[PDB]
Scaffold this motif. Structure first.
Motif, PDB file in Angstrom:
ATOM      1  N   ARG A 113       0.816  -1.210   0.000  1.00 42.43           N
ATOM      2  CA  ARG A 113       0.000   0.000   0.000  1.00 42.43           C
ATOM      3  C   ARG A 113       0.853   1.265   0.000  1.00 42.43           C
ATOM      4  O   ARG A 113       0.432   2.304  -0.506  1.00 42.43           O
ATOM      5  N   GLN A 163      -4.024   2.351   5.533  1.00 41.70           N
ATOM      6  CA  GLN A 163      -5.036   1.316   5.720  1.00 41.70           C
ATOM      7  C   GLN A 163      -6.387   1.719   5.140  1.00 41.70           C
ATOM      8  O   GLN A 163      -7.086   0.893   4.553  1.00 41.70           O
ATOM      9  N   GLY A 219      -9.507   2.722   3.125  1.00 35.49           N
ATOM     10  CA  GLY A 219      -9.877   2.389   1.764  1.00 35.49           C
ATOM     11  C   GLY A 219     -10.131   3.603   0.892  1.00 35.49           C
ATOM     12  O   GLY A 219      -9.969   3.538  -0.325  1.00 35.49           O
ATOM     13  N   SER A 252     -10.415  -1.555  -3.095  1.00 42.17           N
ATOM     14  CA  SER A 252     -11.267  -2.697  -2.787  1.00 42.17           C
ATOM     15  C   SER A 252     -10.444  -3.980  -2.762  1.00 42.17           C
ATOM     16  O   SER A 252     -10.113  -4.534  -3.811  1.00 42.17           O
ATOM     17  N   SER A 253     -10.114  -4.446  -1.563  1.00 45.73           N
ATOM     18  CA  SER A 253      -9.282  -5.635  -1.413  1.00 45.73           C
ATOM     19  C   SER A 253      -9.927  -6.671  -0.496  1.00 45.73           C
ATOM     20  O   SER A 253      -9.250  -7.292   0.325  1.00 45.73           O
ATOM     21  N   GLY A 268     -11.737  -6.357   1.998  1.00 48.27           N
ATOM     22  CA  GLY A 268     -11.796  -5.972   3.396  1.00 48.27           C
ATOM     23  C   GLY A 268     -13.220  -5.857   3.902  1.00 48.27           C
ATOM     24  O   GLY A 268     -13.471  -5.944   5.104  1.00 48.27           O
ATOM     25  N   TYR A 269     -14.156  -5.657   2.979  1.00 50.85           N
ATOM     26  CA  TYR A 269     -15.568  -5.555   3.330  1.00 50.85           C
ATOM     27  C   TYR A 269     -16.409  -6.573   2.562  1.00 50.85           C
ATOM     28  O   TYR A 269     -15.949  -7.676   2.266  1.00 50.85           O
ATOM     29  N   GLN A 319     -16.967   2.958   4.720  1.00 55.85           N
ATOM     30  CA  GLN A 319     -16.123   2.538   5.833  1.00 55.85           C
ATOM     31  C   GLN A 319     -16.775   2.847   7.178  1.00 55.85           C
ATOM     32  O   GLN A 319     -17.609   3.745   7.283  1.00 55.85           O
ATOM     33  N   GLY A 346     -15.919  -6.224   9.033  1.00 53.30           N
ATOM     34  CA  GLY A 346     -14.766  -6.851   8.412  1.00 53.30           C
ATOM     35  C   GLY A 346     -13.769  -7.404   9.411  1.00 53.30           C
ATOM     36  O   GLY A 346     -13.706  -8.613   9.637  1.00 53.30           O
ATOM     37  N   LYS A 347     -12.981  -6.515  10.009  1.00 52.11           N
ATOM     38  CA  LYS A 347     -12.000  -6.912  11.013  1.00 52.11           C
ATOM     39  C   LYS A 347     -12.561  -6.730  12.419  1.00 52.11           C
ATOM     40  O   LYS A 347     -11.822  -6.453  13.363  1.00 52.11           O
TER      41      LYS A 347
END
Ligand SMILES: [Mg+2]
Ligand SMILES: [Mg+2]
Ligand SMILES: [Mg+2]
Ligand SMILES: [Mg+2]
Ligand SMILES: [Mg+2]
Ligand SMILES: [Mg+2]
Lengths: 150, 150
Positions: free
Chosen positions: A18, A31, A33, A51-52, A54-55, A70, A75-76
């Motif tokens: 990134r 971090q 998005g 868009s990786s 993560g969601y 966001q 997600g996390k």
DNA sequence: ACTACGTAGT
DNA sequence: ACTACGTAGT
């Protein structure tokens, strides 16, 4: 920070980390998005999104992308709460009216690829199983750009 | 991963990010201060440590460095607990007997500098105001290496 | 101070 | 799954 095409960055170029997107001015956050700025007249406008997986977003080989906002712990995560129309979420929304190009970086299973410029056509509120609001951003790829396979 | 001097890495060389230390084989972890491996006969041995003000350590321009062990929530923290003699902490301890060279990377106020090879002379247990055990590692710089100013 | 679609290693 | 002397931005 710039809006639109970044000099020396081609559609299809691949990146490992990134922080490369930060150095090359593609995507400054480490971090987050969504990246944004204030234009002529302090109104937040998005410049690039990532868009990786993560969601909730699932990417197909279409010209239309659905991007989740966001926040709200999705997600996390931590207990679920409503998403807020501030910062990146707000910026993407304003980008609808301003009709400005937004860079899109997709994560691949080294790890990131630049897929070109998009326009934020609209947005709306979804209410997931959490019982909380999440934002959905409908972006369309600007016609003319080189195609990318997946 | 290697033990000792890394080819192409000079004493005094400066680096911006931790991931550069990963690529050049100086320090593989992304956050962890201590890196280690298992040698001939599965015994943990330290290969490199990073002191960037993340803990209690204060660095002077001496040949002897006091390095705090990891864990027990000291620095970026969460309730305090005892530190454990495992992984990196264990590896540094075993490096006392094995007498192997350990790389040292100091953080500067771009952000990291390689200061050369050290030997772990000893270790002991301290009991801070927490009421919990912390480890202290006494390392000495191997004579002969180029000096570095601060 | 807090956030955040990170990142490697075990 | 959990850890971890990270990292940028607001
Ligand atoms: Mg849906
Ligand atoms: Mg002391
Ligand atoms: Mg992993
Ligand atoms: Mg472990
Ligand atoms: Mg900062
Ligand atoms: Mg803010």
């Amino acid at each position: 920070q710039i809006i639109g095409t970044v000099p020396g960055v081609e559609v299809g170029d691949e990146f490992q980390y990134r922080m490369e997107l930060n150095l090359l001015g593609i995507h400054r956050p480490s971090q987050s998005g969504i990246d944004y700025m204030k234009d002529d007249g302090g109104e937040l406008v998005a410049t690039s999104i990532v868009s990786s997986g993560g969601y909730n977003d699932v990417l197909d080989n279409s010209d239309v992308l659905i991007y989740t906002g966001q926040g709200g712990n999705v997600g996390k995560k931590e207990p679920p709460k409503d998403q807020q129309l501030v910062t990146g979420n707000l910026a993407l929304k304003n980008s609808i009216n301003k009709k400005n190009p937004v860079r899109v970086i997709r994560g691949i299973k080294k790890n990131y690829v630049y897929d070109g410029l998009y326009l934020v056509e609209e947005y709306w509120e979804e209410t997931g199983s959490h019982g909380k609001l999440v934002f959905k951003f409908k972006l369309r790829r600007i016609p003319g750009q080189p195609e990318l396979p997946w």
